[PDB]
């Protein structure tokens, strides 16, 4: 069982439930819009392979991720013994882990800003997708924008970035996991670093569009 | 949209979303194992009453409180007319409102000890339930002993707590919702304190038995 | 409706008409300006960053302003009973709240001379963002330079001190709107102190631009 | 560009913005409800000519008036030659200009509050027109009661003198636009001291208006 | 010959002249406007009758005013007689002939503020109709918009009060022309009283469409 | 478009409309006479020019007086801008323009005198002149005398001062046409004036043979 005071705790029950709905909102796009867009065929297969090719293994990554963290949290609740106690609450080398495995997933973070540029393209020349949008849109599941959610994964990554951050506030150097939490810092820092470039282009992408939408 | 150096909107979102998982981790009780314990009849109506008592209305309670927050969230995270940006990029008020209307579920939590000591002393002098229990403890579902999905409600307070007082300290006085949260953290603490009796004794209850199955 | 010689009815109509065209100016940055340096790829990511990171905010600010101004006046304008003619006929209460409002923003009308001096360091040194400005400029909804519009924001700012002291100065302290404006004249005041030396920097950036720009 | 915190920019800002919305006040009577009249055939013609004959031209004058200030602040906001600079940062042979123009209107202004009582006649002794006013003052273009409309022209007279007041008192005797803004401020006190009258005739009918609209 | 000193005969001079010019407007309409609705069918045949039938006989009765008018002139300029230079330089037997006449077509004009009416309801509802109306207002004998030459009727009375007034100030009472004069003044006088409604409606219809194309 | 009770958008329509009228009576001669006087060869080639060459360019003048003025009153009918309804509800600049640049023609009017003693005194000692004249005469166009349109110029100026003098009495001075109408006024005035010899010598020559054919 976990003591109360455990900062690290908590901050392992954060990342693994914003894990959790994060993988909920990629699948409005991976599985629900998909489902949409086969049912109609509107958009051009071409555009179909650039959302779904950019989208689909960062969702396959994170769900491996958030298998190992599920795991290691339910040994944490879980009746631990003696020896393994030590191993069971922590959380920082699944997290070294994962971090350095997102480096070689850059190169698709890197192109979301021009699937949603695509997408914009497209979609105004393309009454028929522009429908099918709009329909979309007025779904339950569809609590945003789609084009909102292409933000969602590059995101994802700053808010990892912040989670460690706390971690290695929280630790001190002494501790089992104080090490590894650091290491896994640098590498989602050097991650965001690199597509920050992409964020921002993300970014004032969807604020134009919005502002656009409401003029004074 | 939500701003990415703004703490208060990812403090929110992990309010959000560590209230999904906790309503999950309550329907192991008031969902999967209501279901099997009717299919057996393996329990006192009494006993049974007992249970789904002090538990179904703090269900209904957080039903209640995920609505207004993954309402505000959607709110915070998507499109708005300009004049409307401050009013959707904040969370105090809700919490406020959801943490003063807690204190008048105190109550519940306060008997969670006797909950888990009364059903502790069933699934010891009884069959049916050791029986009954010791299979629902393998499906997927149910991923701690469910003897120890009693504590997860007051463990929640806690977190609450926690959640809280980060939020306090990320805003600046002038900041609309700094008044809101400051209320809000108040309340809740003292819910916790007026509940860290009851904690112990559950904290307490685990271990117990945590170490006579440790021989 | 209000009296037809009422100087506070004035002034308040003042402050309305003239947020109204203020708002479509920074439009012509956050909207049409964006437009074109996203379609023609000619800004660099952090530049564009430092430009939308610091105006985004300050239109925020501006539209829930006007929103507020707007509402007022109308009641003003309109017939109102009797026990609400007093609160419909005022503006201060409105103008303290929004100055307060404005102290969370100084930071970034702070960093609108870093803003335009690293844009002309842009443009000096890329043939490509050069010629969007020179191709933007020519567009009829850019009627001024476009970097001159980034010098409105501030000398916005001065412009509420003026019209707040013209406020204090008509009321008398018996009046029901006298403390709240005096209040907020006190706060605006606040803010074009902190930002006094961003005011003459960028007074001294403009001077020297159309200077440079018209030499015999 | 003006230097920011130049008063006398700021009074030519007030002027202008307050100018186009006056006239888009104006269209509310001069097209969206003459629209409707004609549309209903719900006015005596006679009735109908009272009322355009003495707004019509109003509206025109103001429109000359607002094409001129345009022009003139949009050389004063844009860069300029410095042989231009201080004829393009100056209002006051603008505004003498129009203000002797607008002696040849006195005349109609002279009229509108004939007019609004004439109006009030008709609606209360004809249960038709009454109706087509209550139907157009729910359209959101008319956001006030339609004859408070009747009441913004004279307003917008007084509103001159206060502004002229303005710059008269900003300039020190030696300056480029001393001699003329003083010169307007007299012509336009001459208006207003011949409409002082029908001024306050305007004035004690509004407030007969609202007065017995609310009775407790 | 005429006298160089004789106001009346440049009246007369002047009434002839401008009688010229409003028949070639009215054949804008009669001639040449029907020319090309008879070529399209655009028009359809009721509405059509409605224009033709209220113009038609105006424009025969002033071809005859005209004629008169025309032949009284060759003879004041031509050489006279003893007896008959009395009877050859004077115009108000003919003037007061025609004003008379004239009350019995009041009926067609009254009708004119309906033909405008009709025109512009069915001309926005018909494509087809609008296409040749731009089409023929780009004729050079289409100087104005059409429907604005459905007002040259009703303001040529207008033109005839004035003209004649202007004639019963120059005779003096001793005159063997003034009688007749101040009878035809009373009765194109009577005649424009009675047309008011109309030329006020017909001019309100026409400041409509035209403000409507431009509003601030 | 054009206001009812002003009475300057009515001179103007006269302007324009008696301007057209004299055109045509000058037509009478620039056109159709020389047209009749080319198919006979019944006039001397020198004094066929004596004619066309005080007359010609005239009417050049008026046609070109006459375009601007129509050009002007269309604006002034038609719809236009609310701030330019101003520059085109006036007529005095044009007149000024045009009654300025009259004076640099009065030079020909001088030798209308002239124009009909010499061409008098050709048709009386002239037998193929008295006959194309008499027949010419007769034709629907030629509606006074023919030798009498020689009048018609000297007429028309006179037309211009009365009729540019009943626009300086309408206006009060604040209005902007004002100032150009009586410049204008004055122009023509002088003009006239300078012309008052040449006028009565021609009406002198019309009212004499006007009696010699009444014997």
């Not at 590894?180 to 993300?202: F, G, M, P």
């Given at each position: 069982?976990?003591?109360?005071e455990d900062e690290?705790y908590?901050?392992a029950?954060?990342?693994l439930?914003?894990?959790?709905?994060?993988?909920?909102?990629?699948?409005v796009?991976?599985?629900?819009?998909?489902?949409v867009?086969?049912?109609?065929?509107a958009?051009?297969?071409?555009l179909?392979?650039?959302l779904?090719?950019?989208?689909?293994?960062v969702?396959?990554?994170?769900r491996?991720?958030?298998?190992?963290?599920?795991q290691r949290?339910?040994l944490?609740?879980?009746?631990?013994?003696?020896?393994?106690?030590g191993?069971?609450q922590?959380?920082?080398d699944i997290?070294?882990?994962?971090?350095?495995?997102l480096?070689?997933?850059?190169?698709?973070?890197?192109?979301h800003?021009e699937?949603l540029?695509?997408l914009?393209?497209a979609?105004?020349?393309?009454k028929?997708?522009?429908a099918?949008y709009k329909e979309?849109?007025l779904?339950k599941?569809?609590?945003?924008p789609?084009?909102?959610?292409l933000?969602?994964?590059?995101?994802?990554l700053?808010?990892?970035?912040?989670?460690?951050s706390?971690l290695?506030?929280?630790?001190?150097?002494?501790h089992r996991?104080?090490?590894?939490?650091?290491?896994?810092?640098?590498?989602?820092?050097?991650v965001?670093?690199?597509?920050?470039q992409?964020?921002?282009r993300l970014?004032?992408?969807?604020?134009?569009?919005?502002?656009?939408?409401?003029?004074?």
């Amino acid at each position: 069982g976990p003591h109360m005071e455990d900062e690290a705790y908590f901050i392992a029950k954060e990342i693994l439930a914003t894990e959790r709905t994060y993988l909920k909102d990629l699948e409005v796009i991976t599985v629900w819009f998909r489902s949409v867009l086969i049912k109609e065929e509107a958009m051009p297969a071409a555009l179909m392979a650039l959302l779904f090719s950019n989208i689909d293994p960062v969702y396959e990554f994170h769900r491996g991720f958030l298998h190992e963290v599920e795991q290691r949290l339910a040994l944490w609740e879980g009746p631990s013994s003696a020896h393994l106690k030590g191993d069971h609450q922590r959380i920082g080398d699944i997290l070294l882990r994962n971090m350095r495995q997102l480096k070689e997933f850059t190169s698709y973070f890197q192109r979301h800003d021009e699937v949603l540029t695509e997408l914009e393209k497209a979609t105004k020349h393309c009454k028929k997708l522009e429908a099918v949008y709009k329909e979309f849109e007025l779904q339950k599941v569809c609590y945003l924008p789609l084009n909102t959610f292409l933000l969602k994964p590059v995101q994802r990554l700053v808010h990892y970035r912040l989670l460690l951050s706390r971690l290695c506030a929280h630790y001190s150097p002494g501790h089992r996991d104080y090490a590894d939490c650091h290491e896994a810092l640098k590498a989602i820092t050097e991650v965001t670093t690199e597509l920050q470039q992409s964020l921002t282009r993300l970014e004032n992408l969807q604020k134009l569009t919005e502002l656009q939408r409401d003029l004074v």
